[PDB]
């Protein structure tokens, strides 16, 4: 009983992706999810809960597709049960997360010879983030015991800084990552 | 290792040492010019001598790179700026003879005086005498005496010096692989070696002469109105067909006609615009003037002034307790140090001069990331034009009512605009035929087209042909009338003032087109124009690294010198000159003589 | 808790070293409170690389080195991973995986004389580029051309070290800057260098 294809083209072959601090939430439902088309890209397809062989076997619920851009050394960072700079200040997966983390190197769209300064990351934050929490705040972090009233300087740093993303590093190459988070525990 | 890598190493050593030594020489000159004492004379005379000796030593070592095996253009430009010889290619007895006749001409021009022909003890020299006599008096005979006695007592003493100086400079130029000394002064515009932007030395002649046929329709009407207004002041002395005498032009040599505004005013019922009485009422000082100039300059995108400009500069004269030269000069000491030496009084002319020299400072601040042999203008005409285009916009009534000196409820009719444009034309338009005539005369004397026994006879007919100035007294071939000028007797280039005048109006028209101004060109305020500042900074950052033919097209679009922005500025004055010359004679007859 | 790391000796020194003979002092067996160095003004050159300045007093490292030298203000940006110039190639090279902070401040009121402070030198000519954390203090005459000169200067033979002037009127970018570079290592060792409890 195949009725219509799920919109996998708009969440994978999009025009642009968002940053890791302002990751979007694209909910898809009311269609048949076929994953045989998903092998079109030419590296990371680790699935938890459901094996990637039997991915086209079970009927699921509303899947949340989150698109963001990270670098090559942070594909080991985003994992259920990890801590650091991305998993504590930008995007944290839950401990009982069921889904696949699909990452692949591109080196053609998010790497410019002069610099691609459109993707930001946060390094300064008061407390650790909750699972499935988004923070697109822009207030200046207070590092010391002295109120700056909005100004910068020592002990008052901007939390949002940009990457370089040059196409010459070894690692630091930009990865276009789409993570699926289904919540039920399918073609014919 | 190639030759160009050794040249880059030698230039990296020279740009390290020469900046420190030039900072020492400039600091000694600043300490001399800020405190005229005896302890600062010897320090300057030692620091400048050490800098000149270091420059001669580094120019001696630079000739071991033969300039033909280096492919980079920046290294080649720095090496051509460093391999200058000058008088070093001649014998010593001639190289010191040229210096001791140039110093003789300088001491004659500085020390030479003219005595009154009624008292042999009362004598008047140059700076407190005939300059103020021929700018304030209005009688024929006194100005005739002040012209003829100055041409007789001072002029004929320099002709046997000039006859040797011409041949010595021609030998010095032909020893440096040129054809004449005029080609050496034309070598500043030589951009021979750049693809698509080349400029020969001989191209400047037919580039200056080609832009002169469009000025003379305006210049003939201007000269027509000038002698039509001057015939009422001097009756039966100036004919309506012939030329103008040299002693009735407001000055000594006939360069600037700005002292003729008291007799050739268009509308004498209303006075000219001035905000000195508005500045002395709001308690304005030099610091407020320079801070208002800074607020004008930061509104286009140019950065703030440095702390050393506000800490170490002399912006106010301290009185008669510390002697200083009260001549306004913008200083470029290097290494991030930028100062202004000016005795700034509360005057609108000082208010324009402050913008004119903050333009020079912001010019010096732009190419600070350049090598030391490229820390100058691209030629000798951009530097004064960058200062002049700020004084053009600071003199507009829009800026004067925007900064607070003028109340907005005043009437601005055309009777003020014509009076402003004619006062601008008496300084700008009236000096260009004299400049072109003097430079063509020097180019034809240097190249050998004027013989030694045809100097004054050709000079006083080229004046009639170009400028329209006839001599009041017949002069034989013993006088030397070009030698009575400061720029000729002291070995200075004079083609800079003709090119700077066209570059200033080209820059003004470019910034007015970028500023989106719909009215006339003489009311164009570029104060709140931000998009023009990023285009002007594309020219200010270059310095001497890239060609001036490419530096023009970065700001004005054109590749050569254009005269149409000069004619578009005085076009409401040109229509008024066409309206007023309905009964006069547009032109001059060269056969008329007042004697 | 009364065992403090010698931050006052590498910051409040009587005189700093040159950039070609930069000092290297090992800091060990103490607690490192980084909130002590806030006394200086102007200060805003605090580009910490690798680690974050907020989590600086949370991880315990091994032996920490400190490099101190004097350069001009327009060459502070060359002290970074992946920079090209004359200080970051012939005088002091930072690694691409450098984990630490670069601390610099204005020193025009202490390292300037009227007229001339020629005690601070810098290497200008060198055959090959420097390795990361390499200290060259040789005084060999640079061979600019293809001709030996046997230790004496002259044509195509220049001295590698050049002298700074350091006059106090040298604008904003040519002013002398005292730079302190801290490097935090993570070798397999008993970690003792971290802040108070
Ligand atoms: C989504 O992924 C890529 C965009 O990067 C595209 O894949 C192309 O698909 C067509 C259809 O079969 C193939 O002919 C091309 O060879 C594929 N290109 C590459 C680089 O693999 C396409 O936009 C989408 N993929 C699919 C399978 O539709
Ligand atoms: C290092 O030098 C700084 C200034 O050069 C000094 O800091 C002083 O520290 C004492 C002790 O807390 C304070 O009372 C002073 O007010 C500080 N002075 C300034 C100007 O900040 C001091 O000599 C050294 N720093 C320390 C922490 O000893
Ligand atoms: C020429 O010299 C400039 C300045 O040193 C340099 O930037 C440029 O790369 C050089 N060009 C070549 C071809 O080496
Ligand atoms: C720059 O100049 C403007 C104009 O006066 C002034 O308002 C501003 O405070 C100046 N900024 C600095 C940093 O000096
Ligand atoms: C620009 O416009 C503002 C507002 O009208 C005015 O106050 C200011 O004087 C103008 N000029 C400059 C140079 O900022
Ligand atoms: Cl004359
Ligand atoms: Zn000037």
Residue numbers in the entry:
A (entry chain B): 328 to 369, 372 to 499, 501 to 515, 523 to 525
B (entry chain D): 19 to 613
C (entry chain A): 329 to 525
Sentences from the paper on this structure:
pmcThe Omicron variant of SARS-CoV-2, the causative virus of COVID-19, was initially reported from South Africa in November 2021, and quickly became the dominant strain worldwide. Compared to the original wildtype (WT) strain of SARS-CoV-2, Omicron has 60 amino acid mutations, of which 37 mutations are in the spike protein, the target of most COVID-19 vaccines and therapeutic antibodies. We report the structures of the Omicron spike trimer on its own or in complex with ACE2 or an anti-Omicron antibody.
An unusual RBD-RBD interaction in the ACE2-spike complex supports the open conformation and further reinforces ACE2 binding to the spike trimer. The ACE2 bound structure reveals that the Omicron spike trimer contains an unusual RBD-RBD interaction and extra interactions in the ACE2-RBD interface, both of which contribute to the higher affinity of ACE2 to the Omicron spike trimer. Consistent with involvement of spike dynamics, ACE2 binds to the Omicron spike trimer with 6-9 fold higher avidity than to the WT spike trimer, but binds to the Omicron RBD monomer with 2- fold higher affinity than to WT RBD. We suggest that in addition to destabilization of RBDs in the closed conformation, the RBD-RBD interactions that stabilize one RBD in the open up conformation within the spike trimer, may act together with the compensating mutations in the ACE2 binding site to contribute to the higher affinity of Omicron and this likely plays a role in its higher infectivity.
